[PDB]
Amino acid sequence: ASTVTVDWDTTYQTIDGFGVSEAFHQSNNIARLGETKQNEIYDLLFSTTDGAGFSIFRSILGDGGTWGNADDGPNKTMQPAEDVWDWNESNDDQIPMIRAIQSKYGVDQILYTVWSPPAWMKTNGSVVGGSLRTDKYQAYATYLAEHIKNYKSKFGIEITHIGIQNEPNLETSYSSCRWSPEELRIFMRDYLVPTFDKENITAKVVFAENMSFNEQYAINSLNDPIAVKRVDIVGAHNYGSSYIPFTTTKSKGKGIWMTEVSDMNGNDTTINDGLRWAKEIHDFMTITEGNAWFYWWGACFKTYNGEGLIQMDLNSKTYKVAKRLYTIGQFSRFIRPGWQRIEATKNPVSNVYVTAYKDPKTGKFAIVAINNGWSKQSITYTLKGFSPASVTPYTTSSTQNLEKGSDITVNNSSFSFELAPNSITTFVGDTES
Numbered sequence: 262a263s264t265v266t267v268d269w270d271t272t273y274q275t276i277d278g279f280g281v282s283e284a285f286h287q288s289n290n291i292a293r294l295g296e297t298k299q300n301e302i303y304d305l306l307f308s309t310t311d312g313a314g315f316s317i318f319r320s321i322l323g324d325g326g327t328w329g330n331a332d333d334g335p336n337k338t339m340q341p342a343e344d345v346w347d348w349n350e351s352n353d354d355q356i357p358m359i360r361a362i363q364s365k366y367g368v369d370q371i372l373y374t375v376w377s378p379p380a381w382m383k384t385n386g387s388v389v390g391g392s393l394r395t396d397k398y399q400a401y402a403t404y405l406a407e408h409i410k411n412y413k414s415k416f417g418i419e420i421t422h423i424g425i426q427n428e429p430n431l432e433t434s435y436s437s438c439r440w441s442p443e444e445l446r447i448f449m450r451d452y453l454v455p456t457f458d459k460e461n462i463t464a465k466v467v468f469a470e471n472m473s474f475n476e477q478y479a480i481n482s483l484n485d486p487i488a489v490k491r492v493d494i495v496g497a498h499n500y501g502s503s504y505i506p507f508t509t510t511k512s513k514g515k516g517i518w519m520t521e522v523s524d525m526n527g528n529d530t531t532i533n534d535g536l537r538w539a540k541e542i543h544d545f546m547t548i549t550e551g552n553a554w555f556y557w558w559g560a561c562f563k564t565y566n567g568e569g570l571i572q573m574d575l576n577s578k579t580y581k582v583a584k585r586l587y588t589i590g591q592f593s594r595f596i597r598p599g600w601q602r603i604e605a606t607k608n609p610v611s612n613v614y615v616t617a618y619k620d621p622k623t624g625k626f627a628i629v630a631i632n633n634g635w636s637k638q639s640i641t642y643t644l645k646g647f648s649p650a651s652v653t654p655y656t657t658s659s660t661q662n663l664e665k666g667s668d669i670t671v672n673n674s675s676f677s678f679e680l681a682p683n684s685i686t687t688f689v690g691d692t693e694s
């Protein structure tokens with residue numbers, strides 16, 4: 262019987278949201294399941310009433326590669342040659358899904374990440390590996406600005422966040438482009454910042470998304486007086502690393518987005534894998550104090566690993582939902598863009614981890630409690646600085662998927678709940694009536 266204290270007036274970072282991606286034709290793989298299952302998958306991902314309520318959507322800016330195939334491969338680029346633009350909305354197979362989920366679910370944060378500049382800008386003449394030619398830095402700055410401008414003016418899509426390079430540390434067997442940190446500062450200071458200023462770009466920059474979770478690729482730009490003007494967000498993946506503070510990023514008042522993580526080595530779809538990712542979010546919120554957290558694919562055609570939250574079998578036209586969709590939903594469905602983390606006893610007892618969030622504009626709040634141990638844990642929650650009448654529990658476990666429970670009466674700013682082993686429960690409430 263342990264105690265968690267939640268303080269309404271001790272506040273931390275603003276939460277920008279939670280995201281997924283459908284890059285590399287996975288958006289088209291959803292549609293191939295048929296209209297009925299397509300809408301079911303949109304619902305599971307983005308609905309705030311019967312889904313995970315993801316609030317950010319990450320997509321690939323087409324590079325024109327020729328690798329892969331139609332099930333997993335690149336999209337045509339809107340600038341296939343230095344002297345040719347091709348604003349054909351059919352080039353980007355993510356546009357139909359973006360329009361549908363912005364309309365139906367109000368998803369209004371749209372991140373486009375570049376995996377590679379087009380081949381004619383690359384040192385090896387290919388979108389696979391290599392680097393950006395130094396005599397193509399301006400062409401790439403123009404490339405990025407023209408995409409933000411013309412996705413709006415031609416396709417009606419507002420790109421609110423632009424990711425300038427996915428994993429600049431890595432050359433892969435698919436779309437990739439290697440940068441050094443100093444090459445990124447030179448690109449920001451001498452090309453991106455003056456081009457974005459000249460074109461009056463208001464989209465925020467998610468800085469080069471390091472494969473490992475550190476700010477090393479951003480330190481050079483963050484300390485540059487010109488580049489720092491548009492280092493709006495420092496992005497990073499969490500493949501093979503752990504959650505640490507981004508010291509220089511916080512000193513410059515910038516945001517932190519963990520824009521991709523998944524299990525590429527195993528295929529665990531049970532609550533144990535789900536609680537692994539819930540614990541990653543908890544560490545992200547409390548160690549790094551980050552602002553947005555992303556899984557990799559929302560739905561994908563890989564039934565053999567954990568790169569997506571939903572595994573689609575294209576041959577039988579079926580899909581299977583892993584527990585990680587719901588364990589991540591325990592955060593993402595309730596913590597909307599603009600919410601604010603508040604103080605809660607982060608570790609009340611062994612294997613129990615707690616965070617808390619509030620909406621400063623409605624008085625709504627959410628308390629997310631993880632129990633990734635083997636023992637039932639009775640917890641008494643003391644609410645400091647606010648007094649709701651009741652809380653509503655939502656639980657995910659080996660037998661429950663974001664299951665709404667009976668309301669729990671709050672007696673003098675205190676309520677108790679027994680956390681089941683290997684489970685996660687969110688308590689949701691409102692202070693204004």
Ligand SMILES: O[C@@H]1[C@@H](O)[C@H](O[C@@H]2CO[C@@H](O)[C@H](O)[C@H]2O)OC[C@H]1O
Binds near residue numbers: 329333427472498500
């Ligand atoms: O099927 C392939 C995917 O597995 C691959 O996913 C990559 C996983 O590592 C991440 O760091 C990368 O950002 C992500 O692209 O993408 C290519 C696709 O063909």
Ligand SMILES: [Cl-]
Binds near residue numbers: 322324338377
């Ligand atoms: Cl591109």
Ligand SMILES: [Cl-]
Binds near residue numbers: 431
């Ligand atoms: Cl890369």
Ligand SMILES: [Cl-]
Binds near residue numbers: 529534586
């Ligand atoms: Cl899972």
Ligand SMILES: [Cl-]
Binds near residue numbers: 555
């Ligand atoms: Cl992602």
Ligand SMILES: [Cl-]
Binds near residue numbers: 528529
């Ligand atoms: Cl899996």
Ligand SMILES: [Cl-]
Binds near residue numbers: 597620623625
């Ligand atoms: Cl809200």
